[PDB]
Design a binder for these strands. Sequence first.
DNA 1: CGTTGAATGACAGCCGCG
DNA 2: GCGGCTGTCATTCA
Length: 902
Amino acid sequence: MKEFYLTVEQIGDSIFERYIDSNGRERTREVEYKPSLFAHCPESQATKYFDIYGKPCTRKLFANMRDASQWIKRMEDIGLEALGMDDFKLAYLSDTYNYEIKYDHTKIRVANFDIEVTSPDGFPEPSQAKHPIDAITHYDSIDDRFYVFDLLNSPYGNVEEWSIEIAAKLQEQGGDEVPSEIIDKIIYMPFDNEKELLMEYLNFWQQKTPVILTGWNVESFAIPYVYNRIKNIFGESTAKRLSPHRKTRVKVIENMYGSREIITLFGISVLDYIDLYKKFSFTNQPSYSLDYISEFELNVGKLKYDGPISKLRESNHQRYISYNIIAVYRVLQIDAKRQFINLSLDMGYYAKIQIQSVFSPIKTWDAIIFNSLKEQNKVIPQGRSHPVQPYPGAFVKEPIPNRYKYVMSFDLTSLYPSIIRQVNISPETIAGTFKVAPLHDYINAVAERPSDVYSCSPNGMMYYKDRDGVVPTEITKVFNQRKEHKGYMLAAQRNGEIIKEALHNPNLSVDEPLDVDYRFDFSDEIKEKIKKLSAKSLNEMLFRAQRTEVAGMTAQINRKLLINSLYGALGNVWFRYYDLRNATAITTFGQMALQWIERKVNEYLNEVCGTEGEAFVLYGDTDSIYVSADKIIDKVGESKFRDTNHWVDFLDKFARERMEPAIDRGFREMCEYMNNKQHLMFMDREAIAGPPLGSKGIGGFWTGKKRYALNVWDMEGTRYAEPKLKIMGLETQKSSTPKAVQKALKECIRRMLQEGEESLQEYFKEFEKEFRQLNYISIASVSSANNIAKYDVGGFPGPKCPFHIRGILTYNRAIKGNIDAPQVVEGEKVYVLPLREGNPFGDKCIAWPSGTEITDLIKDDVLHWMDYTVLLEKTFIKPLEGFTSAAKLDYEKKASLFDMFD
DNA sequence: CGTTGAATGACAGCCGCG
DNA sequence: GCGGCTGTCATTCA
């Protein structure tokens, strides 16, 4: 096995790295790394190094890393560019590992932990740790063991031990139902005093120091707390042992509302799962508690329990510890799904960066590019600060609010990355500017062709067409690698079919699973001997067939992740290759594109229908366009279709056969018009929607920009068994919308699209009749609870106090007396409910923690003094109205038509 | 925290009005 | 009271 790195850090004049060596042994070494940078020199000084612009550069080998930056700042003082990799860790890595890293996740120690802390006087502050740490569950991927630490005596109680026999038992028997999978992997350890404990823990830590440190919210609590507790009880020098280099930094993160701090453990990679999840889950959630996120993906959350956590240790210390074990285990199961940890490992190494830098697009690319340009003896531009200037972005069409019966949408492929390639945009391929006519002039093709020599963007930029720029080259490489890997994947899929049938009726022989390369299919070299193989060979082989199957997935996805982040980085000032003009070129170019094709798609449906400038493209947002199909369905006659699937295939046919080509023809003219280095604008039919043939349903409708709904039957070719609702923007997607409502509205919409007004009306009349019977939380609202401070003058409403916050403060006004109440921290979400004026809370609204019941204390007061009328009205009716007006329908019989004017 | 630019829509507060 | 703006606070397409 080729050796790889685990972690790396720079402390003073040296590099501290942890890594696996040629023999799977984790070592750690200090290195007096001598960096190198560069400055522009005289061409007559024949060198082998050149910046991306072409100018010759001379290497500056430094004595140590201080001189490096001491020079970098000294160069900044003289006014001359200092080129090269300043993040010496990055360089160090490229240098120390110059080849493709192949790692063995099995040698990388990945710890996952959680701690419990009994506190009567409110939520325990991590930067204070005023209370004792009374439990710790710390799982380790190496040993595949859960190491538990139970405190038996604290100012808050003295308890028996935790019984694993009981923990295994069933709920109805008195157990905690800790899962059989982990029951043999637990390792209990009780202690007499906190000190006895922490000290053992701190000690167990060194015995098995983590490389990748994860767990839920462990970076803003578990770690900060444990660090500070130990510090307070033993002092900073004891706490710092928490770092394998005994170096820690109290990095202060001044949020956009207030502040809180996190501890930096040099020599460790903190990948807090909540954040890992938040970036790669791709889906907003009304709550990010491990509880909500666990039910959401495995059908079960954390252990349930009677009474408040505040007293769970005393009253039932048994559950309390099982609970702490189950929590560390939910995360482990979620990851068993998402693979986010693995993804990270993969990603980070492909780019040769500190694993946790994965959370950063700017840093991953900077790295990827650097290693590339390095391989070919080129030096990277020096980064430079630039005023943060806002530039234009995507083009969103103002949709005419209406219902649209048949819609067909096509989407441009990787628009932004693609544009960079076709126009060849890069800091060093800028050939120059050109007089610029209005954007519409270039959309109707009535504008003087920009340049007859260079590649062009509608914002006045011109790029060379001979040279292939650094940026586009790099995307194209990624773009290829992906198709490449997703090529080794589509392969294992065929061998998972050839081997699947080899188990329908296996033979009997003393054979071993043949050695092939599932990345590349079978021919005769091994496709032949697929019958004499025993029944034992056939099954162990298919275990080694799909093991790779996923291998591709991981790469193709990390590749897709990069493809998609690139623009963002390019648009970010802290980026090395950032450029305002290039940013605007990209953006402005797609503006032209999307609307140019709009013109083309509009002129082609007008011919094939002999119509008078009918506006076929009803809406388009960024890289896609929705087409009204009505006029097409009528050329054939809506009554000449055997059923639904009939007219769909019709459209699908028309799409591919006639339209796609009309488009490629178009985009090709445009590529010529701008004189780009390469035609890469490719659109694909995406969705096909309309109501169920024969029904009174309307099929779809638009409220306005970013707000519409469709009854789709076929997405990119995959036909559905039952129509599927694609709802965007509407409150049914609004995480802050009640649930009894995020439901109805949804039904309402569906009844609207496949049934029709008659339906909608009946439902509504019901959901309005039986409204007074819903579970308070079901009909409650949501939102982020920020700046709670800025508006609570004496605990009362001040100036411009939002509806949710001024509700939170009617809440404080209710829980001021019982500290066993759950005060709401700033940053998190909070449910809300109106109040039938003339009540206790002497106000308007009362809020509280999202995903949490409302305290018994004040729970049964609300549940009698809450306004339905005003609640129904504002969270269901108000928005429905907005819905049905656009679709031009009525949620309730006998209306006055005139009501739609002015 | 981490990586853009367009766009809704729930509310709080003035302003202009015999 | 009530319709426009302008302006925070929240969320979300692509």
